[PDB]
Design a protein around this nucleic acid. Structure first.
Ligand SMILES: [Mg+2]
Ligand SMILES: [Mg+2]
Ligand SMILES: [Mg+2]
Ligand SMILES: [Mg+2]
Ligand SMILES: [Mg+2]
Ligand SMILES: [Mg+2]
Ligand SMILES: [Mg+2]
Ligand SMILES: [Mg+2]
Ligand SMILES: [Mg+2]
Ligand SMILES: [Mg+2]
Ligand SMILES: [Mg+2]
Ligand SMILES: [Mg+2]
Ligand SMILES: [Mg+2]
Ligand SMILES: [Mg+2]
Ligand SMILES: [Mg+2]
Ligand SMILES: [Mg+2]
Ligand SMILES: [Mg+2]
Ligand SMILES: [Mg+2]
Ligand SMILES: [Mg+2]
Ligand SMILES: [Mg+2]
Ligand SMILES: [Mg+2]
Ligand SMILES: [Mg+2]
Ligand SMILES: [Mg+2]
Ligand SMILES: [Mg+2]
Ligand SMILES: [Mg+2]
Ligand SMILES: [Mg+2]
Ligand SMILES: [Mg+2]
Ligand SMILES: [Mg+2]
Ligand SMILES: [Mg+2]
Ligand SMILES: [Mg+2]
Ligand SMILES: [Mg+2]
Ligand SMILES: [Mg+2]
Ligand SMILES: [Mg+2]
Ligand SMILES: [Mg+2]
Ligand SMILES: [Mg+2]
Ligand SMILES: [Mg+2]
Ligand SMILES: [Mg+2]
Ligand SMILES: [Mg+2]
Ligand SMILES: [Mg+2]
Ligand SMILES: [Mg+2]
Ligand SMILES: [Mg+2]
Ligand SMILES: [Mg+2]
Ligand SMILES: [Mg+2]
Ligand SMILES: [Mg+2]
Ligand SMILES: [Mg+2]
Ligand SMILES: [Mg+2]
Ligand SMILES: [Mg+2]
Ligand SMILES: [Mg+2]
Ligand SMILES: [Mg+2]
Ligand SMILES: [Mg+2]
Ligand SMILES: [Mg+2]
Ligand SMILES: [Mg+2]
Ligand SMILES: [Mg+2]
Ligand SMILES: [Mg+2]
Ligand SMILES: [Mg+2]
Ligand SMILES: [Mg+2]
Ligand SMILES: [Mg+2]
Ligand SMILES: [Mg+2]
Ligand SMILES: [Mg+2]
Ligand SMILES: [Mg+2]
Ligand SMILES: [Mg+2]
Ligand SMILES: [Mg+2]
Ligand SMILES: [Mg+2]
Ligand SMILES: [Mg+2]
Ligand SMILES: [Mg+2]
Ligand SMILES: [Mg+2]
Ligand SMILES: [Mg+2]
Ligand SMILES: [Mg+2]
Ligand SMILES: [Mg+2]
Ligand SMILES: [Mg+2]
Ligand SMILES: [Mg+2]
Ligand SMILES: [Mg+2]
Ligand SMILES: [Mg+2]
Ligand SMILES: [Mg+2]
Ligand SMILES: [Mg+2]
Ligand SMILES: [Mg+2]
Ligand SMILES: [Mg+2]
Ligand SMILES: [Mg+2]
Ligand SMILES: [Mg+2]
Lengths: 260, 205, 127
RNA sequence: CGACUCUUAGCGGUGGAUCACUCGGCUCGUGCGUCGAUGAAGAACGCAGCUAGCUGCGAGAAUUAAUGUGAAUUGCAGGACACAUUGAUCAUCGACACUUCGAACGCACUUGCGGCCCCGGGUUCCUCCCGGGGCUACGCCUGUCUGAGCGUCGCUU
RNA sequence: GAGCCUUGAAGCCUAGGGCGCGGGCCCGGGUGGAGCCGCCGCAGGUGCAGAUCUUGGUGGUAGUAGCAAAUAUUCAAACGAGAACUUUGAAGGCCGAAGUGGAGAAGGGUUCCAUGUGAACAGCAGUUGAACAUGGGUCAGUCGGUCCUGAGAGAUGGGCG
RNA sequence: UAUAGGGGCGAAAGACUAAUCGAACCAUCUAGUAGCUGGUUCCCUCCGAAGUUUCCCUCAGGAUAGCUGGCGCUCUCGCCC
RNA sequence: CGGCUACCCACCCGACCCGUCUUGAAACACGGACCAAGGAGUCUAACACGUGCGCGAGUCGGGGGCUCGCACGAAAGCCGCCGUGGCGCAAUGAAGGUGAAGGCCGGCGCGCUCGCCGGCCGAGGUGGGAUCCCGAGGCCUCUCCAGUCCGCCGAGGGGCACCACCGGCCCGUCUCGCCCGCCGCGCCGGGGAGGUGGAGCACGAGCGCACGUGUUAGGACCCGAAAGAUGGUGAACUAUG
RNA sequence: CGCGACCUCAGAUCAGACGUGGCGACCCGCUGAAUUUAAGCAUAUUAGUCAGCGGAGGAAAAGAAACUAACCAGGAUUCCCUCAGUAACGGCGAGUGAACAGGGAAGAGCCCAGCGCCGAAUCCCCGCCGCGCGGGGCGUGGGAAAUGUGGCGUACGGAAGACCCACUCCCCGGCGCCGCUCGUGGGGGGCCCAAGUCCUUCUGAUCGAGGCCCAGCCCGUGGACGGUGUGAGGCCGGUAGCGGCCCCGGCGCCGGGCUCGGGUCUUCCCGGAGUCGGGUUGCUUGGGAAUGCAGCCCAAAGCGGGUGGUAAACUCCAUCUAAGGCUAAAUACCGGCACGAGACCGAUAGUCAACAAGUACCGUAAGGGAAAGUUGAAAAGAACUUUGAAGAGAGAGUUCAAGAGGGCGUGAAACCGUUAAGAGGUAAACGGGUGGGGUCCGCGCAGUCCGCCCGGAGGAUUCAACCCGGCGGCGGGUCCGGCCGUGUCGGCGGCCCGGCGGAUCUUUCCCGCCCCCGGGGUCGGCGGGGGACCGUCCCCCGGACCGGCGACCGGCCGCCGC
């Protein structure tokens, strides 16, 4: 409140009145007359360095770095290892990028939505979400936050026809658009590899929204796909290739321990 | 107070500044209010376009920006007179009028009156009853569109003369030079002095 | 999920508005479900509790199939009293035990001119 | 052997720390833009069946009238229980009412002292006789009435 | 973490077992009764032995100093569980009329009276009280205010601002 | 009843002005400034001083240099010189 | 039977009571009776360096606008003829102002302390310089024959970055003299050779975001004055009418 | 002498009407310090801030140039980003510090005094007459204001008056109604989906696994709250251009009153004064030979006056018309009435105040100002017997729990009492190393180690060796019938039934302007559109490399299970 301690009018005693030198309130007939005034070490006083409202809350990020992170999350969501190591149940899923027809965006009821999620063998993750819905831990329950819900699949769509209604009641689900890709929803908690469910048009629009290494993006004016550093990211084949081992040194696997 | 090496600083925080600090925590709310106001105004004035009043062609005054052209406030009374429409009717027609602006160049006067003529030719207004003239039987099914964005008829996008390529003439090798600009500056600096010298010389005769 | 920007999800605000609710809102809060054979008859799910209607406890300590009747609706305590759901004091005198109306199911209603109107309104709104 | 003292553990007492809860704050944003001479803010007094404070009210005083809702309030007896009459509580609140001081307005405020008009009772009347009702502050605006000017003017004694 | 929990969460205690050099942590047991924690990152109003530090509580001192300004109390009885402090009677004394008397103004505001209990107040005690609870109590033409001016304060006319 | 704070009042002690008077009390500026005292909270590992030069109304201080630590970077040995 | 320990007891040895000011503390120097809770380097703006990231002579939409009304949305997505604009890409003078390419070859005019012409690549040279290239020489079953097979090196060459020097170019100055041009033949302009001053050029590296340290202005690590100003309350005590 | 009119004026409890004061977060006018910094302090900074006074509104002020610039000029005002920590100010020290551009949000412009014309065609009041719901304005007649000057017509962007020319029939104020207004206009009351079913813990259930092969049911409703704990379905509530009911405001249509614009020509008119400016003295500003304001003095002109950032004279140029006024917009809001949210606080924290808090209490007064939450799911608050006069206690009783017994959840430390153990002349305590006692822990103590292989002692089983049927996976050869990646041509083909960019072009292409003599002449130029070449992309054939994390069949070796 910026006035947590300076509501009391008080002055210090001084040399005499050997009780202390901290300012003390003036008055009488009250057991609060003569206590500690505003201060850090005093009871009922202001705190050290009162938190101001003009603190730097928001942090801006370059748009190129934002797009880099989005493409990184999209590329990580296509690898089965990275999405399996996050916690999603993809053991029965036929194809990791689940690209379905355009009929799903025209859904109006949630019964057909649950039927589609069960047919695509993605219902195990929603069942895990249902099972893990414990209560918030600590003092966060008082501040209107009493539920812990784990994140499930996110259906990325375009040209909404009522799919938000059909996917707005399933717990752990996330609704995302191709034209508005959010890192907070694609990589929750700072870890890449979230299970994704796409649509035909949502999957065909990615080549035009981000572009390839040959042609730039059509929707974004001056954006191109990020450059690729190591063309072959497999160290095993490189180290075991004959060209590398053609001019290597002897192994020399002798220990040569200490001699007494 | 100073350190080993550093830029000398003079921060303007000696005043009592903490009691007057404007934090922009209401910026999204302000943008939402402005967007809602724009939408409400456009919906109320739907047959008329957003930023309705047409704005003339305006050159920047200073020498730093006088190479580009920009929009302005209103057309001049001379431009209205060359266009042939009355001054007071242009306001209800949808033509912003600036009575304070003057016209010094016919090159801009012709451009402004041409813009006015184009706006008048593209303009289609609605009557109260079909007894009003200067209209058609059907209003192009709401004129194919109700509202326009970012300029009523056309923005102020810059155009440039091409002057693609040409053959160099004979005397172009010795036509201009840095000495030409130097002589021009010297004459501009010593113009009046030479006149006074010629005057005092003719005085002696 | 909540979508109206004019209704709150604050736990403290909800608790305050529930504990300091007026008497005409307490009667709506103190509502009890109806029996299965009566729900299909009246085409309504729940109904507020009054003084004359009979009721049957479904959950709690004094639960069973014994049909009972309410004698007091204590709106201040969000509770109702039943003549047979009682307890003995130290000296042996009887005193009613309080059970919440949400933990009790109704079997009989007083057919009043206003009760029939509420029933038909709820039925026409459920359609 | 006992008593006293010291160190540990169990239990007990003073003590009210930690933990859990929160009808409370702090911050941010949104909507509206509202006091009074037709009596504002604030203050005093009083009002409940039993009632001290907070809250809510003004001698119609823990609320009146009307509308919506529909069977109660509650600490205790009573009480309208009546609803094929008008029907409890609650909320809304546009209709009535709103004591004294307070810009406070009859003078001052020690609740005194008046002054006019009207209505009921007193010698059926004024003349410093009781009760009740209305008016009786300052400045200023428009108009009316009253009247002062060896300020200017015309006719006249 | 398809984490642990009303077959027992947090917290607290413990001559129990054990780990880490250490900050600390794990398990067993006893209370307790509704939440909590590990891992990956993020942000702090984040670690106390002191500051004649702030608040609250508790010890040695210590059952110690102290209940000593103004001559003084005693006997019998009653009401009471309880008597030195209350009541009645008697004896011995003080204030001795500039009082330890009878009335007032300021100030206090129910402290005045009757009944009733005896944990708190009365520096011991109490059947007692100016304490507590209940109920009563202030009657004016001729008592004073109200009237009048005194020193003095003060609005309008006017002036200044 | 009148005089109210750089004012009042003073048979003058700078005495009195609500337990405060060689300048009252109350609230705000104000979290006034201090080269001056006091305090400043968890573990382990590694490195580890100075009280000295010059200048300053400088001597209980600061600036500069020096002492110290961290981040590195550029090369050199590792197979008669 | 075995058991260190946060249980108690005893002996042997060593053992002064903690914190900070100080050359010197256990001090006859200061604070601490004890216990529980609270308690002190924070945040903003700016600067310097270092590190991580993205782009790159470019970089940055933080300011606005667009899509659809939204719990999560005070988020996120986009602007592309919104880059206006900030930083950097050019510096030097007080200013009028000016404002950065060298090297080889041949010729002519006195190849003159001497300018121009023509051709080429195009940011000079010296001494060091990681690395790279060439490389005599020898190192693998009986033999003249070979491409891989075993496999290092004397010497030599072009030389990253960086270091020192010389020379070169730009701007402000001082000395010396001569030449060229005319939108007008002048106290008009331009040019050279030498010495100096610049935060300069001599194939550019910055921008935006985050973190850490250091300095500084904000009350700024926390607690602490003697005092100053503004506006009000007191003559119920006391001094005086 | 009197009467009357005018003019400066007085009184009323004359008729009607208005202001006072309060809040004051935001705004406007005035003056208004010091602590601090300058390591001291006077100028300066703090600051044209705090305190003080006067006023109003949801906003106020500002606002239509006596403006900015000096070139291809722009054009009210307000707010944001840049300009810019710059120009500049300063014991030029500390420090202070704008403005014009430009891009954005919003963009609404006008009136009057004067000069002239209109028989004052103007305005207020009073009273009867013709009108409508909740009550005020239209037509009639007299009493005043006003010729020392009402009103239309007029406003520097010119205007007025008189001919000529070709035109325009409209707009503004109530009354009754149907259908809508963008979240599907605003306000208010009530209603609307889906388990409480089986089994088992628990005082209590919302705990615990499932509900046939269509996954027990709903979901546009799985946010939250209350309910004996931890609920999507038991209950208000939430989603829903969901429904029905009541109240208020506008869009189209039936009576009533006003009502000539545009251009050329001819004629006339055209302006704010103790004010600008100057001298001087203070305050202020970055404003410097003085930015602005104020006090005194001097105090004008109409080819004039102001400004052009260095004072003064001569000349030219650019811009504006000040001493009169009104106006919503984007802007601010710590007060007020309601609402929503939180990486904030969780009872020594957070506002002083979570509770009978600006309360108790303190000082005469201004003023100062606290402490203080938790029984239990439900009082179900301990009947009754006994001791004591009572406080209190022993039994008993409710609750799962009294180890929750009326400031009672949990219940630490300091301190104290009791019980048990040990010890005691160098105060206690402490580190190194042992010993003794005790609690407790693990083992059952001359009797306890595990797994593999082989040789023996007895019983029961199918498989393994091998073959056959057969599926699933691995490996490479032919890359076989096909898949795509990396490059070069090619069908010039998808250019018209394919996309982007390019200061690369095509004036012998078009459209709209323009120059010269309707038409002609490219003689030249401007904007838009069409199309030719360039660098990036879409299909088949032919081949160049990898067949690699892109994959199928045919055939083979070698595995696994059935
Ligand atoms: Mg506080
Ligand atoms: Mg403050
Ligand atoms: Mg204060
Ligand atoms: Mg916790
Ligand atoms: Mg330092
Ligand atoms: Mg809240
Ligand atoms: Mg204890
Ligand atoms: Mg009523
Ligand atoms: Mg008065
Ligand atoms: Mg009266
Ligand atoms: Mg238990
Ligand atoms: Mg509980
Ligand atoms: Mg802290
Ligand atoms: Mg402590
Ligand atoms: Mg102390
Ligand atoms: Mg306490
Ligand atoms: Mg003590
Ligand atoms: Mg004694
Ligand atoms: Mg005494
Ligand atoms: Mg007796
Ligand atoms: Mg006696
Ligand atoms: Mg005597
Ligand atoms: Mg006497
Ligand atoms: Mg006496
Ligand atoms: Mg008594
Ligand atoms: Mg006593
Ligand atoms: Mg008495
Ligand atoms: Mg009493
Ligand atoms: Mg009498
Ligand atoms: Mg008298
Ligand atoms: Mg006076
Ligand atoms: Mg006056
Ligand atoms: Mg003074
Ligand atoms: Mg005194
Ligand atoms: Mg003073
Ligand atoms: Mg401080
Ligand atoms: Mg020194
Ligand atoms: Mg060093
Ligand atoms: Mg310490
Ligand atoms: Mg010292
Ligand atoms: Mg010393
Ligand atoms: Mg020491
Ligand atoms: Mg000491
Ligand atoms: Mg001493
Ligand atoms: Mg001490
Ligand atoms: Mg602590
Ligand atoms: Mg630019
Ligand atoms: Mg201080
Ligand atoms: Mg001073
Ligand atoms: Mg004063
Ligand atoms: Mg006196
Ligand atoms: Mg100082
Ligand atoms: Mg000083
Ligand atoms: Mg300051
Ligand atoms: Mg100043
Ligand atoms: Mg102020
Ligand atoms: Mg006012
Ligand atoms: Mg108002
Ligand atoms: Mg004007
Ligand atoms: Mg800058
Ligand atoms: Mg100055
Ligand atoms: Mg400075
Ligand atoms: Mg200033
Ligand atoms: Mg619940
Ligand atoms: Mg729930
Ligand atoms: Mg329901
Ligand atoms: Mg002039
Ligand atoms: Mg002029
Ligand atoms: Mg000039
Ligand atoms: Mg000049
Ligand atoms: Mg004006
Ligand atoms: Mg004006
Ligand atoms: Mg506005
Ligand atoms: Mg926090
Ligand atoms: Mg407190
Ligand atoms: Mg008894
Ligand atoms: Mg308990
Ligand atoms: Mg307790
Ligand atoms: Mg013992």
């Amino acid at each position: 409140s910026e006035l947590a301690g300076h509501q009391t009018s008080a002055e210090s005693w001084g040399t005499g009145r050997a009780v202390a030198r901290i300012p003390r309130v003036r008055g009488g007939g009250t057991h609060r007359s003569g206590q500690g005034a505003f201060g850090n070490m005093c009871r009922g006083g202001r705190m050290f360095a009162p938190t101001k409202t003009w603190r730097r809350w928001h942090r801006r990020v370059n748009t190129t770095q934002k797009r880099y992170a989005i493409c990184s999350a999209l590329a990580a969501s296509a690898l089965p290892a990275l999405v399996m190591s996050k916690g999603h149940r993809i053991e029965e899923v036929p194809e990791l990028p689940l690209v379905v027809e355009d009929k799903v965006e025209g859904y109006k009821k949630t019964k057909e939505a649950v039927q589609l999620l069960k047919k695509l063998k993605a219902w195990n993750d929603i069942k895990k979400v249902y099972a893990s819905q414990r209560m918030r831990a600590g003092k966060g329950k008082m501040r209107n936050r009493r539920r812990i819900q784990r994140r499930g699949p996110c259906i990325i769509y375009n040209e909404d026809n009522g799919i938000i209604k059909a996917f707005r009641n399933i717990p752990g689900i996330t609704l995302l658009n191709v034209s508005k890709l959010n890192i907070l929803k694609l990589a929750p908690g700072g870890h890449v590899g979230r299970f994704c469910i796409w649509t035909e048009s949502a999957f065909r629009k990615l080549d035009e929204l981000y572009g390839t290494w040959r042609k730039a993006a059509s929707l974004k004016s001056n954006y191109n796909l990020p450059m690729h550093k190591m063309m072959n990211t497999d160290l095993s084949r490189i180290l075991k290739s004959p060209e590398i081992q053609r001019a290597l040194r002897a192994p020399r696997k002798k220990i040569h321990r200490r001699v007494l | 107070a100073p350190s080993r090496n550093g830029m000398i600083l003079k921060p303007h925080f000696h005043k009592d500044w903490q009691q007057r600090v404007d934090t922009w925590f209401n910026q999204p709310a302000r943008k939402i209010r402005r967007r809602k106001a724009r939408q409400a105004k456009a919906r109320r004035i739907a047959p008329r376009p957003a930023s309705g009043p047409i704005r003339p062609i305006v050159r920047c005054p200073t020498v730093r920006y006088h190479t580009k052209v920009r929009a302005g406030r209103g057309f001049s009374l001379e431009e209205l007179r060359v266009a042939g429409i009355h001054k007071k009717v242009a306001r209800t027609i949808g033509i912003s009028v600036d009575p304070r602006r003057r016209n010094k160049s016919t090159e801009s006067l012709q451009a402004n009156v041409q813009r006015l003529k184009e706006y008048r030719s593209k303009l289609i207004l609605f009557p109260r009853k079909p007894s009003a003239p200067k209209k058609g039987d059907s209003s192009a099914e709401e004129l194919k569109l109700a509202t326009q964005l970012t300029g009523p008829v056309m923005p102020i996008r810059n155009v440039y003369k091409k002057e693609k390529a040409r053959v160099i003439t004979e005397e172009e090798k010795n036509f201009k030079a840095f000495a030409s600009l130097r002589m021009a500056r010297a004459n501009a600096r010593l113009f009046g002095i030479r006149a006074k010298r010629a005057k005092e010389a003719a005085e002696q005769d | 999920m909540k979508f109206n920007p004019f209704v709150t999800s604050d736990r403290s605000k909800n608790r305050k508005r529930h504990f300091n609710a007026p008497s005409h809102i307490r009667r709506k809060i103190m509502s009890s479900p109806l029996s299965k054979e009566l729900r299909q008859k009246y085409n309504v799910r729940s109904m507020p509790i009054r003084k004359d209607d009979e009721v049957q406890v479904v959950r709690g300590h004094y639960k069973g199939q014994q049909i009972g009747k309410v004698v007091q609706v204590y709106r201040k305590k969000y509770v109702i009293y039943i003549e047979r759901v009682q307890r003995e004091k130290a000296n042996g005198t009887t005193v009613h035990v309080g059970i919440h109306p949400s933990k009790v199911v109704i079997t009989r209603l007083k057919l009043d001119k206003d009760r029939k109107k509420i029933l038909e309104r709820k039925a026409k709104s459920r359609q």
